[PDB]
Amino acid sequence: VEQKKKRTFRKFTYRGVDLDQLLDMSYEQLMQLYSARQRRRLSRGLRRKQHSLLKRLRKAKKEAPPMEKPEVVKTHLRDMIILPEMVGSMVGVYNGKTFNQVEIKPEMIGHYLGEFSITYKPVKHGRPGIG
Amino acid sequence: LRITTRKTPCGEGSKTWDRFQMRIHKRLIDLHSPSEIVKQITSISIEPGVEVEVTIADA
Amino acid sequence: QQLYWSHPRKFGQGSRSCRVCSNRHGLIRKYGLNMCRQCFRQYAKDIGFIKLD
Amino acid sequence: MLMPKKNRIAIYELLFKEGVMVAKKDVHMPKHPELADKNVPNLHVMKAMQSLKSRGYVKEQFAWRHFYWYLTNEGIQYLRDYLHLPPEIVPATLRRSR
Amino acid sequence: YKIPDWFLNRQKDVKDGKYSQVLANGLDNKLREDLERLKKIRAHRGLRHFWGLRVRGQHTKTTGRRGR
Amino acid sequence: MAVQISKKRKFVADGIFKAELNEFLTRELAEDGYSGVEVRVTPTRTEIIILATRTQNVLGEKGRRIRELTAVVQKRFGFPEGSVELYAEKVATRGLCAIAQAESLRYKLLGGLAVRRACYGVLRFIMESGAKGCEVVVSGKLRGQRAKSMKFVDGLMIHSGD
Amino acid sequence: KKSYTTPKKNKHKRKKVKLAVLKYYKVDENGKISRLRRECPSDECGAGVFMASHFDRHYCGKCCLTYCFNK
RNA sequence: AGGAGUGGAGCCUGCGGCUUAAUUUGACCAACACGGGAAACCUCACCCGGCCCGGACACGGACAGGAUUGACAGAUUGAU
RNA sequence: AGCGUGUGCCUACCCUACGCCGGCAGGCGCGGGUAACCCGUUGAACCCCAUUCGUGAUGGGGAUCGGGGAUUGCAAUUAUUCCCCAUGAACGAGGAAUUCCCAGUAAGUGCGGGUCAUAAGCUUGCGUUGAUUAAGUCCCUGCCCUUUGUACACACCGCCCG
Numbered sequence A: 001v002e003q004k005k006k007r008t009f010r011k012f013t014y015r016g017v018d019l020d021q022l023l024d025m026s027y028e029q030l031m032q033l034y035s036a037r038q039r040r041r042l043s044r045g046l047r048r049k050q051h052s053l054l055k056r057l058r059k060a061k062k063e064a065p066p067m068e069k070p071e072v073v074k075t076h077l078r079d080m081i082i083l084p085e086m087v088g089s090m091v092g093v094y095n096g097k098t099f100n101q102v103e104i105k106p107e108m109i110g111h112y113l114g115e116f117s118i119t120y121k122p123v124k125h126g127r128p129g130i131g
Numbered sequence B: 001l002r003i004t005t006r007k008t009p010c011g012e013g014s015k016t017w018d019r020f021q022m023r024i025h026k027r028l029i030d031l032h033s034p035s036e037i038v039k040q041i042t043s044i045s046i047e048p049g050v051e052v053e054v055t056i057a058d059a
Numbered sequence C: 001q002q003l004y005w006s007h008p009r010k011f012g013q014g015s016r017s018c019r020v021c022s023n024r025h026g027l028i029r030k031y032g033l034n035m036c037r038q039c040f041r042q043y044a045k046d047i048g049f050i051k052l053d
Numbered sequence D: 001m002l003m004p005k006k007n008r009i010a011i012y013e014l015l016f017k018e019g020v021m022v023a024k025k026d027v028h029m030p031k032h033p034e035l036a037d038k039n040v041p042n043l044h045v046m047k048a049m050q051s052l053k054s055r056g057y058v059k060e061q062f063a064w065r066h067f068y069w070y071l072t073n074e075g076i077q078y079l080r081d082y083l084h085l086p087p088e089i090v091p092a093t094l095r096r097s098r
Numbered sequence E: 001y002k003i004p005d006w007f008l009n010r011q012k013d014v015k016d017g018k019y020s021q022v023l024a025n026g027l028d029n030k031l032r033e034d035l036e037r038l039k040k041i042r043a044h045r046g047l048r049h050f051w052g053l054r055v056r057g058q059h060t061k062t063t064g065r066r067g068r
Numbered sequence F: 001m002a003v004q005i006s007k008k009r010k011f012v013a014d015g016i017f018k019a020e021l022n023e024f025l026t027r028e029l030a031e032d033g034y035s036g037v038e039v040r041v042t043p044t045r046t047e048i049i050i051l052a053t054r055t056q057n058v059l060g061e062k063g064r065r066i067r068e069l070t071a072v073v074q075k076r077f078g079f080p081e082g083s084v085e086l087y088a089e090k091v092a093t094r095g096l097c098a099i100a101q102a103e104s105l106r107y108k109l110l111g112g113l114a115v116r117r118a119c120y121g122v123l124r125f126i127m128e129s130g131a132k133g134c135e136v137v138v139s140g141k142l143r144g145q146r147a148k149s150m151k152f153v154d155g156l157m158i159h160s161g162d
Numbered sequence G: 001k002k003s004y005t006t007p008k009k010n011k012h013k014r015k016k017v018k019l020a021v022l023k024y025y026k027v028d029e030n031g032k033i034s035r036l037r038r039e040c041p042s043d044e045c046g047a048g049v050f051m052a053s054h055f056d057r058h059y060c061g062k063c064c065l066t067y068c069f070n071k
Numbered sequence H: 001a002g003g004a005g006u007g008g009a010g011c012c013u014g015c016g017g018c019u020u021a022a023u024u025u026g027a028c029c030a031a032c033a034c035g036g037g038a039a040a041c042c043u044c045a046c047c048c049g050g051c052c053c054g055g056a057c058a059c060g061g062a063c064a065g066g067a068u069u070g071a072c073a074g075a076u077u078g079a080u
Numbered sequence I: 001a002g003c004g005u006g007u008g009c010c011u012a013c014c015c016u017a018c019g020c021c022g023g024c025a026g027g028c029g030c031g032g033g034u035a036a037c038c039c040g041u042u043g044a045a046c047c048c049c050a051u052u053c054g055u056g057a058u059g060g061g062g063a064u065c066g067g068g069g070a071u072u073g074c075a076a077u078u079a080u081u082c083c084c085c086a087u088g089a090a091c092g093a094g095g096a097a098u099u100c101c102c103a104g105u106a107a108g109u110g111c112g113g114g115u116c117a118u119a120a121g122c123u124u125g126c127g128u129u130g131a132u133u134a135a136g137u138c139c140c141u142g143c144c145c146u147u148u149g150u151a152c153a154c155a156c157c158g159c160c161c162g
Helices: A028-033 A035-042 A051-063 B034-042 D006-018 D046-054 D073-082 E024-040 E044-053 F008-027 F055-059 F062-076 F098-110 F114-126
Strands: A073-076 A088-096 A097-101 B002-008 B016-023 D020-024 D058-062 D065-073 F038-042 F043-049 F082-090 F131-140 F149-153
Touching: A035 E044, A051 A073, D006 D020, D006 D065, D006 D073, D020 D046, D020 E044, D020 F062, D046 D058, D046 D065, D058 F062, D065 F062, D065 F082, E024 F043, F055 F062, F055 F082, F062 F082, F114 F131, F114 F149
Parallel strands: A073 A088, F043 F082
Antiparallel strands: A088 A097, B002 B016, D020 D065, D058 D065, F038 F043, F131 F149
8 A cells, every 4th residue: 555545635535434434333334335245245244264364464464564564365265355454464366376466455445356366368369270 | 747858868960859748637526425434435446546535525 | 084075055056966876967857857868768668658749 | 983883883783673774875964864863974884884795794786876785694693693692583574474 | 406316327436425416528537537446456347448358247259350 | 744745746756666666676586587566555555566477586485585675665765664565476478578588588698698599599489478479689799899780570560650 | 087297295194193101190109099180071071081281271182172271 | 933031230159260277078961059058156077276085805914001083272274 | 818837846945916115126014825726817918099209320229338226145256137327339121142931821929838046039838910922843952763874882072094
């Protein structure tokens, strides 16, 4: 994170409220901010051993030196809502073999992890073949 | 009962099907008499594989 | 040993199985089938049906 | 194990009483209902009959996803001594069929 | 003037905090922002946009041609 | 003990019981000259008439085999105990019983014997027993590793219509 | 379908070390039996088995999901 | 003799070619909305990681201060 | 208007009337149906009757695409499906070629079943509206029978010459 004017200040507060309020909110107030698909995942789910991830992120964020990011926490889970608390961590996300690392921005909140790591080569061609 | 399904396993060749059908039949005779002599005489004197269901009352 | 061996199968094409040997691929349910279309044919003579049309 | 020593008895004793066993081909049976009552959470019937069958003492049919194990004379002698039973007891059956 | 919120173009734009109705030349300006945003974060979306390929779940094998 | 399934589904489940049994038995009574079954539910009792030509080998000494078979069905389909009752039956005129004639030819062949003389021997029996005509096919290998077919036919036959 | 390609690790099951057996009961004089650490307190435990002297961790091995003191 | 179309346009779907770590595979009038084949997982045969044995039976070896079985926490690990 | 279908089945699941709440998707409370019994006197579409638009790539066409709301599931991202507002493309009757069809038939038009936790532009059946053209021929393509010729029989996709 090194951005400005994307969740506080002049230009952009996250649907009328700053990041600072979100962190003090429970999930209950947070989900009522319009993003329909998110609300399913919380109200139904309520932690199906996402426990393993969310403790490692906070932990590693704490122990890491000031003005420096942590190492990585890795996942095969490409599914989990990006949240304000998660921001500042660095996460490697399994594709089919490869853990593509990404920094979490406050501007990515609401999205999934798996949108920021691709799982195919974009494509080139080609020279049509024989048949 | 209709069943309309492929005639070819592992589909190849001209596309064909096969209609099978089963026809059930129902019919019922209503008696009003003492339940004893009915349940006595009913269950006997049946040669073929044909089902019978006795009911206490319906009317 | 292990603490897992299974994962939710509750719907879909993997939580029902057809009676060849536990064969699949050949999705089947009809009127209480659970009976494989290849063998259904071999039971045209057997009881359930006699072909008439 | 391979299986406990309790669950051996409960199969070998049950076979001796009916003279025949039957079961289904599965590996996700949770407690094996349909006798042996709620103490076989896995293969165990199939796995123990197969070892018994290797050494004779039983015959085995299989038809439409169901086993059928038929106890034989040799296994009756074995099971009788193995389970310390009277020198003449068969509770499976013993009468003439008319 | 009591036209309902659901009947608008935009409900909670996103990062602006309100219900809005957008008209001609402001529509384009708003639209171009959301494109830029999805390449800023660089989600799957902005990459598909920048490559000039279909955003939504669609086959591109037999769909397109400009080329042949 | 209730309620009870739809009338449509009532016939399907009967057919499944009629069919499964008919292939269960064929894998055990093959050597005893199996020829079919005929089931009948009767008042508070099941009858399963186990048709085979030689009731001797079916019965066994002290009725052991018939006792095995009844105990099987009593557990397998989850019948109420003691309701099941088996009966045997010998068929007279055995050459109209195609199923048994075919499965007898099988053990003659698998016993280790020539094909031509075996096919002739079964043929004249089913012709003698009474029959307008009759036919035999043997398709598969013999005298090398390419397949052939061998038809042996006598009398009348039909192939078309009801 | 095709044959397995070489690994650079694989190891199956640990050999579950071949420790000397029963020194858990200490004898210094008779008929006295000098027990060390406490014998397991659960109803489902028989309390004839010892608990682990595993200091900074205190755990019944008969239990396999429960009853872990640590002080 | 005529009727309605296809080939033209947009879209769905199958097939070839190309790409890819894998883009599983059969089929070339009598293949090509065909293999009930409208694949989120399952299915699944493919690719990449991790675990398990569900290697019967026989013979020999081991072996009742004992053959052997399982597991908390910490570390490790996508993973409790 | 018709052929059907429906929970008590596989392992967890049916078809829905009625009442209430919501623009809609939908939610919620009650009741029936083992079925010529309840859903369903299946109160379907095209068609029919009256307004509006006016020859304009137009209000024809609805591709592409932004934002938001619901439902299924353990999980919906490369958008499962459904709904609301906005965006408004090709396309203005189609080359060389080619398919299918003779009476409730072609064509137009809707519905049920199949796969199905969620979901038909597919397939299989069913009703509804309902023409024009023929009553023939071997021209093309192909097939049956006879006669004839052959260096062919792996049979003209054959065989064979410099």
